[model samples]
Target: VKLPLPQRLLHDWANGSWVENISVRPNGNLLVSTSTPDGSVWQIKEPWKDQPEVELVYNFDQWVDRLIGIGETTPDKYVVVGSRFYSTDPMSSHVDRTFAAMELDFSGSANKDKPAVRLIAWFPDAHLLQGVAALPWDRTKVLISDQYLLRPRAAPQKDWTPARGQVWTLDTVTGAHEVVFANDTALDTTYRHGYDVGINGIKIRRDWLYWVNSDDGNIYRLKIDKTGHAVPPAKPEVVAFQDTIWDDFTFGPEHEDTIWATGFNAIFAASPQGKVVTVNGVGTSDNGIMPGPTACAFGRSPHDRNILYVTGNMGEIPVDIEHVHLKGWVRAIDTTGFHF
Candidate 1:
């Protein structure tokens, strides 16, 4: 049976803003990646406030356009991804591909007492980098997902390939990176996303790498190690498959197997047994609630610990001939009432 869920609108950005990702700071603050050819990180101190003070934390405005995954390296430090991919016409407009990892340290910083950031590593041949996860046992390393396309989107017929994606393990300290496993069969997809998004959201839980393939609409995970290599079985363990495309997800501390995921305009919760339940079913553009959702994460503070914070980015999935932009906002939903 479908149940009701409640959400509190924390803050809303300009309509059509691609608010990509969110990470809850250990001190109960928030770091949101508001990207759209303007890579910048924003902070909302104590977001549960009646009127939270949202401020500009830092900006990568010079060389990057959008920011992607945010992996917590430590209490207040994180590894972030930035990329450039613009478009108006799919056939021949924009694909200035860039993949750069950066570090954000909010502890003991000199600039406005905000996070101090520095470039980590750059993957020159990366087509599309999606989600990121920091290794639990080590803080200096992280893993990232890359969606593959043949190349030269302008020539879709000859260049498009329903090929495999990639996962790269990067060490922030030495700027060393390696393809943990790129040729995994599960990373290959049959469907194509104009360019193809084989794998999207990536997370590390219980020594496993959980990820979702947008084109295939499948969720999978594999046993992993601190050095970013596979375990004994060395194959992707299939989780679940949903009809809609997934963007990002977060697991609950109360249940390591329980996960909450975000989609274009919907929210879903999944169990370890592969039962995926719709948390916030699809919404109409007129429905002010969850108009353009992309990602979600649980709060780290007691005030909103059971609250799941969500990000909306106006992902007008090309269902229609043209894409319609909508309002982008951050909202919190109570998960204590979840029955699934």
Candidate 2:
């Protein structure tokens, strides 16, 4: 059977906010990250429709972009791989992007006025922080991807070449930080013609950290435990590297057994065994949806693992996020032969 169109969650935001990322919390509530950089982490309690929306429950110091869900720590919270993107300096055009990790305190003394938001730590240098994942050990430690900012000179003679990509990690209790990975000079090459390389999304699973460099079509991986702490990614093994620009990703729905990635407008599934096509359908523009996908989260329906809640979008071309949902869409995938 073909997949079903996802039900659009109700929103009364006058600013016309849309879900940029969606993940399942350990408690079974829905954790949705809106495109509004300063948006709150919304928790949809059971009986999703009737659940009251609570703001200020999990507010942050700055803008929160991609929401990567809960870890095993006490208070069990979510992670937002975001940055301080708004700045006045020109160099800041590229440096404004930074990362922060937060713990959610649903039951705090400062409930109404001040939501408890502890900074796991902030990225040292800004690079348009976007995607994130929780590590295996203790899960208190997590990994974040630095989707570097894009710089394309306006005119025909403008310079738009290499777009740098970086990756880092943080210790939740302490503010110590380190660079776990970074893309090579090859990323400097222009995409299709004049676009620069960009590393948007990242995934750390099992024993390795996986990342995708959007512009030049590169996916990289590295052994985690042995890498130097808080330093640039060194001696990484380039797993499944390719010339095809792979976009966002997350562990597949059900068992977190597989990984799904978006390429241009298509979807590909990768496992420890190998990579294969899951859904290669062409993405169509409609209702102001995003033109192409940026980051995606795969959540298995609490009712059934066979069912998945896949949320993602297109690109950041217009500078200002337009009605991207008009150009983008979310789907609820129910596997063919598998009974739900």
Candidate 3:
């Protein structure tokens, strides 16, 4: 019997860092974020090259999760999101969950002054700033998915009720923000320090906004109102659901109805018809399968669009909350063979 999907390694990292979100740049480069105390944002300059080059563009000095590129900008800029957690068994103080926009100026003519970093917006109240999606109609507003509240000194991982997951809109121009989607219907009850399975990935294709919940493994879609916002009284509908956990996902190839979602050990293809199929499943000899797969995005180049790029960890999800070293790397799956 043939496996539903097959994959191959595109890039490998030696540091054993937990790679998280991935975004394709307008210039055909790739931006990937990692999860570590000193995690970084990496740029894959030539992904198709024989020896692809991975450059460390910026270091957040903490775990960074999401990455997205803003289009039609001079000097080139991208948005990165990250958060801070202090305790392990019993949760402690959490602070400085930030959303930063960084500028890279290659015109500087000096290597030291090449990239300038700035914190455009800081949400002190944000606990787990998991996923981010750029608005298609408006470039200035970015929608952020906050997993849920982090209660103080809460110890038991399974005992706590899942708080409501929120989607907030940040105005890049004025630095003002508002909660666009906040309700119990948008969240999942499962919560863990290292494994967060809430509202994880969001993306806007054409006029529709789509999001996924990790804990419940549900795919949802909503139409953006005329004011360029996903507003109230307009509830999102669940397009599909799986019994497994999900990390992050993006629109697949050029198909509007298709979405490619990453799981801890597998990648699923979902559609509005309420169908979900595992295109590929990965595992290690020691870890069993899908060892902490994080996020995936489609390549921007024409030749690369049919290739789905995924990022993930090396071993099992962190057993210990702290000092957990996750071996991570990037891989590409050929989807041209799949008829869907």
Candidate 4:
């Protein structure tokens, strides 16, 4: 899936840093989070490239862990949620902490300088809302996963596995807020965290929702019709499980039952076999360590049923966005110009 021309931003943060958690725009563009070249959402769409390689979209500084298009009928109201980049000061008060809603202004061309969002609301209470997903068919309700609340303490004395989920409803008229979906604890004790205890990737389609754990590498799901249409049910079946880091995922475009998930060295296709395959190795850049595999999307091309993009590190240490064309390098996989 070698993206045509400068179409696909490849091995981007490869020179010095790493980029991860890419959210695709409805208008055929890419929204990615980069830790190194100064954390900002890179918007890569059409027309200009030399005009300014990356139009600095959003900068929260501390770390933009993950984000997505709001999936709303109206484009302007798109929002993203992640850890607010803050000072490393240990004495900093929790009252000053910010981790919540950041709105985007889609009024201008996607090429224009990526706008800065107003930190309209802070879930200073939700603890650790890392990943976001707009409820299918209903864009107003966005389901988010809170890996666990990190209390400001040295020894780490709170609940070790205090992970949960929450839903935020947008008030487009007055920008009010409401809690529709609430968070709950996992029913399975065997579930473990792949990276310290945080949940990495989550996705929702119409009636179904899914989330991946960074620790134990477990993939879970809940049917919208089941359990009284609850956001976080007392029991969500272990749909799929893998040992890899399991960073981000997306549901199939055509087949609603088919789901695809990706992580450091593996890309998985969900089914009874739970097939797991290696794609590429993790980059060594400082920022890459924080955000993980920055991009992955499900679409059609030459050899690939899905195109997985990763940030390429350019310093010869291998940091950047790589096109995982199902089998190998995108160029090798694409014999037809149909590659995108």
Candidate 5:
């Protein structure tokens, strides 16, 4: 069966706004982060209303990448990660990232001061953090996805060698993190055509951590222990491999066996049997179908969980002498009537 195309939910977010990742709060509110250094986390409280109540919860001085709700931290808190690329010399470049927790209180009087944002971790290593997943068994620990396991920007793109990417466990309590899984021949990105991104989208299930490699166009699954620790010495199982560059994915809210994937030109679906199908494709509408979708998530509320939200980067690059700046947007695909 063919699923319907995604619908446009919201737009006119910001300039240079590449919405990276999204998190659905327990209260059904939605939070999304951007890819710009001065980017912000946007919150949509009343998404069903005509003018949905939207606001910026936190603005970062660095590039914010991903957002995940940490229920164990508090009743209403979240963790956000930021990534930065620096140039030490004309020939050498480095990438460093940070993590922070946030607290939001919207029960006060209307139009009051916004929620509060706080920093919890600031580990500046050579890791280019891209994707994050909250560990249900351990509130203080989160699994992080690094684009390049150990490569810095100083290396040229073409000459870049194949190296395995890494998944890390960050302890928010003691501010300590360790490499839970790493190998020499695991996550090579040399097969990537243009970009060098690896392990871009991640999610934690019952006892598994599912992730997608944007560079290699593969979806992998790794088993975790009952305590949410990566089962060491365990190799990742290649669940699916395709020729398209997959940006992000989310499990269907109604069916655990169904997975929704976002790509440059289309939204895809994967079944438990490893069958990949197209849910929708990029459209010609001016306000719809962002050609480059980066992240996707389902709503947390009873009324909106069937609504799948997707963010994208549209017209960030130019193809001619005249540079035209086309804004990116956040859209939705209603899955209320669809059956997996």
Candidate 6:
């Protein structure tokens, strides 16, 4: 079969930093958050160039373990969602972990030397906080997802499934948050039939709030106002559905009603109204080519406007295997050759 999109590795992290989420700067720089407890935010300046330099912009030194979803809240500022987890006991930490948000400003001002990483909100009572999306019209607000896995504190049975998940809006400036969408049967994750992850990603586009149900593999959306509140007339609907886990995705051009979705060691593109097309399945693992595809975003520069950048979660193969060929990485896929 013909290969999907031409792919190239941009930057590699040897320290096992699973680059969890991504956001492209207005000026073409790439910012990625990590799954590691280092709480790192990495920057890849001019990634479309020959050899991009990957550098750590900032690291949350206190009260942060992993950074998940990241989005540009304003011109050059981004809001990131993070959580606290005990590395050795990750399963139990799903309920014990603390969720938090931070702001990174790269406005080329006094914090020019380094993007200012400041804590905006902290949620000690939160369940698994997974994805974070910013309200484009309102810089002070952001949408975050609580992926309630409903795992037992000791050991979950093989048939156990997760309960309901939630999506809420947080006031980044005021450190206040309120639940816009409460628990409902529609947001439950069938982890036993699928996997341990629930709502893996979230986004807001064209005045609609959208998120991915990893276990259900559906791209769900609901109409909402600028204040991140739901509209009564507009009900929750599925934009697209695929059998595979829809881990994280990004919208292409405004004219293209397509969502480029990333899954575990997989990638694809789906239309809002129609079918799905595999973008890249270049085999399961080509020595960590796309070990665990977590997050992806389209490039914002003129040279790479059509380029799709992706991140991965690096780890052993499975069932206690421990010889992963490589660590964390961010790869660029040349999507100009394909038209969805």
lDDT of 1 by residue, 280-312 (tens): 746532244565577888888876888888887
Q: Per-residue CA lDDT of candidate 6, range 132-245, in tens?
A: 888878866888887765553444434344647777788877889877775654466766334556666888888888888777767888888877777986567988877776
Tens digits of lDDT, candidate 5, 1-340: 3345546657656564456677766677767776542446778776655467777777765433333222223334556666444431212223534434333333334423465555656656526555677686665567776555355553453344434677777776665776666662435576554544667677777789888877777888889885445687677888877667787788887556678888656777777667777666643333234566767888777787888877765544333312434345677877665544
Model 2, residue 187: displacement in angstroms? 6.9
The CA root-mean-square deviation of candidate 3, after full C-alpha superposition on the true structure, stands at 4.6
Number of backbone-clashing residue pairs for each candidate, in the order shown:
0, 19, 3, 24, 0, 0
**Candidate 2 residue-wise lDDT, 170-282, digit = tens:** 66667566776665543234455224346656666667777666666556666667332322344545555444556566665656556666655445556545554434334
What TM-score does candidate 6 reach?
0.88
TM of each candidate vs. truth: 0.88, 0.68, 0.81, 0.65, 0.81, 0.88
Taking the tens digit of each residue's C-alpha lDDT, what string does model 3 give over 1-340? 2455556666767654567778777666777876553447777776766567888888765333333222212224455666554431113233434444433333344633345665667776655566767676676567777765455223333434345688777766677777776665655545432445478777777877787877666788777774346666577889888867677788768675687887657788886688887777743232334456678877778777777878886555544544444666787777776654
Candidate 3 residue pairs in clash (backbone atoms < 3 Å): 197-215, 265-290, 314-327
**260, model 5: CA deviation in Å?**
0.9
At residue 86, candidate 2 shows an lDDT of 40
**Candidate 6 wrong stretches, greater than 4 Å:** 1-3, 88-92, 95-97, 150-163, 192-194, 282-288, 315-326
lDDT of 5: 0.62
Residue pairs with backbone overlap in model 6: none
Model 1 ranges with Cα > 4 A deviation: 86-97, 109-112, 152-159, 192-196, 253-256, 283-288, 315-318
Error of 1 at 24 (Å): 0.9
TM-score of 4: 0.65
Clashes of 4: 24
RMSD of each: 3.1, 5.9, 4.6, 7.9, 4.7, 3.1
Q: State which candidate, 2 or 5, has the greater lDDT.
A: 5
Query: Candidate 3 versus the native: TM-score?
Result: 0.81
